[PDB]
């Protein structure tokens, strides 16, 4: 047996809940950023929704405008809206034993992104992977491999270097849809999980109806 040294070694986990909106103290974990810092007219708001049925979630909504502000004139592309976890003071996260990122979201036709800030040579570098919404209007889990995020600098694809996966600072979801109109995203949680074992069966919620070989407990 591993005996006592099992408690002396660094603890290992199969997952890590990055952002959890189920708890009623979630605004203190996350911060929102629209383009009003650049002078844009797109607003961003965040709130917790606690329905009678189903788990509580968070609403990342707003009106993503794409109008060039008439104050500084030196912005050009002036539309974006994002939210990310509060700045990391341990000074960084550790994802080296993790392989995928799980986002329990209920999105819309708008076009979202997953943003990750980690240790990079440039402080403005960002690991981005588009949040593929497949069934808008219904809850779904989006799984993004952590080794499938792409390194960008202010939206420009740069030289590809692997994510440090040991000095991750923040994670969040942004909106660079480049399209006018209101947007609203409902988010349950964002977690970092290890490699899932092979399944050959649809999820229990998405289960087809037939006779079950398994005996009912």
């Amino acid at each position: 047996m591993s005996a006592n040294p099992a408690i002396v070694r660094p603890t290992e986990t199969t997952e890590q809940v990055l952002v959890n909106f189920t708890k009623p103290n979630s605004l203190e974990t996350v911060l929102t950023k629209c383009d009003e810092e650049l002078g844009g007219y797109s607003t961003v708001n965040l709130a917790l929704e606690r329905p009678t049925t189903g788990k509580p979630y968070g609403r990342f909504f707003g009106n993503l405008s794409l109008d060039l502000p008439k104050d500084n004139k030196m912005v050009t592309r002036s539309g974006f809206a994002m939210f990310r976890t509060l700045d990391q003071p341990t000074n960084a996260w550790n994802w080296e034993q993790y392989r995928h990122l799980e986002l329990r979201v209920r999105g819309d036709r708008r076009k979202y992104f997953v943003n990750v800030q980690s240790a990079t040579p440039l402080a403005s570098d960002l690991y981005q992977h588009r949040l593929f919404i497949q069934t808008p209007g219904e809850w779904e889990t989006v799984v993004i491999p952590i080794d499938d995020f792409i390194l960008t600098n202010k939206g420009v694809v740069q030289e590809q270097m692997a994510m440090d996966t040991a000095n991750v600072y923040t994670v969040g979801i942004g909106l660079i849809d480049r399209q006018y109109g209101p947007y609203n995203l409902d988010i349950e949680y964002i977690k970092a999980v290890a490699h899932p074992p092979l399944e050959f069966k649809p999820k229990k919620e998405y289960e087809v109806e037939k006779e079950t070989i398994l005996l009912t407990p």
Binding site: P197, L198, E199, F200, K201, T212, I213, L214, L215
Partner: protein, 351 residues
């Protein structure tokens, strides 16, 4: 299947198996040495094997699908149990869980522990329902999680999605349904007795139908003779070609097994007990319908093995009375010699 049978089989399996790295190596090397001696013995003599692929392919399919493998064979020698397994390849010779886990004797009805041999009582005490039979059923059961189905309903995605059905554990039970060594003589040489009800119980009880593979060996009775020089006596010998013929038939049709298991299901529905019940009713244990179904299954297995028998070149047609259970009643256990049961068969009886 029933919960009590599986529980008792699991208890006896745990009694006869520790599943530890210490005991496993001892069992592995014991079985390997016995198999090596049998293999060398087989190459020492002249042997004809026809169908080894059927046993080898039906064992890998059974482990692949988690069904479990069952083997049915004639009992003509005392030492025909290990010797016949000398023809198996090395992968099935030294890997204990890729090996047989039975001795047989099919009940009475009417280093052995490391050799993967469970105990069966061959005397008139108890009956076809012994802890050995429960153990056979348990090793023919892959899990306690799936329901009982007459036909093999696939289940590897719900359980054992990434696991193995019988992981480092054998599923190969091998009976000798005659119950005793049979050493009949010419002209009805190579013939068998009536197959007993235990093998039928192993066919019907498991929640997943096994892959039954009949076998027939002829010639080892000419080596490990029950009486000294029994086949060398004048007038008792006609063929001097001391050739061992092993025949492994095709796995029996799954439709017949499914039909027998459907009859078992109907018998279960005759009473109020469910397919997966806590205990076996005495009606299913000692009842006319269950006994008739078990006798039918045993007769079908015996007929398959007799059909395989004719492939041996030196054989004669079997009398229709030899397959009837009643024909072998009122048998004598005192002569200890060339016996003359109803003036139809000559045997090397030795109690």
């Amino acid at each position: 299947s029933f919960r009590n049978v599986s529980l008792r089989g699991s208890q006896l399996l745990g009694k006869l198996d520790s599943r530890g790295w210490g005991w496993y190596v001892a069992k592995k090397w014991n079985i390997g040495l016995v198999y090596t001696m049998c293999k060398v013995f087989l190459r020492c003599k002249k042997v004809d094997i026809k169908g080894l692929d059927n046993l080898l392919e039906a064992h890998r399919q059974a482990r692949l699908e988690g069904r479990g493998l069952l083997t049915v064979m004639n009992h003509t020698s005392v030492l025909d149990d290990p010797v016949v397994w000398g023809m198996l390849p090395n992968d099935n010779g030294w890997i204990p869980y890729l090996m047989r886990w039975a001795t047989g004797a099919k009940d009475i009805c009417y280093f052995f522990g490391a050799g993967q041999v469970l105990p069966i009582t061959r005397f008139g005490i108890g009956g076809p329902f012994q802890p050995g039979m429960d153990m056979c059923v348990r090793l023919l059961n892959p899990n306690n999680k799936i329901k009982y189905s007459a036909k093999y309903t696939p289940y590897l995605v719900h359980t054992n999605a990434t696991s193995y059905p019988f992981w480092r554990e054998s599923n190969w039970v091998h009976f000798f349904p005659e119950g005793y060594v049979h050493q009949a003589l010419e002209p009805h040489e190579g013939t068998m007795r009536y197959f007993r009800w235990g093998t039928s119980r192993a066919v019907l009880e498991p929640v997943t139908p096994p892959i039954i593979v009949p076998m027939f060996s002829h010639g080892l009775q000419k080596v490990f003779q029950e009486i000294p020089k029994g086949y060398e006596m004048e007038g008792n010998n006609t063929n001097k070609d001391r050739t061992i013929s092993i025949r492994i038939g095709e796995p029996i049709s799954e439709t017949t097994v499914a039909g027998f298991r459907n009859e078992w299901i109907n018998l279960c529905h005759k009473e109020n007990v469910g397919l997966n019940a806590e205990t076996m009713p005495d009606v299913l244990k000692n009842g006319q319908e269950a006994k008739d179904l078990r006798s039918k299954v045993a007769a079908y297995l015996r007929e398959e093995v007799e059909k395989l028998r004719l492939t041996v070149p030196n054989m004669n047609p079997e009398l229709p009375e030899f397959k009837e259970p009643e024909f072998w009643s009122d048998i004598d256990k005192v002569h200890k010699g060339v016996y003359n049961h109803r003036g139809k068969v000559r045997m090397l009886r030795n109690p």
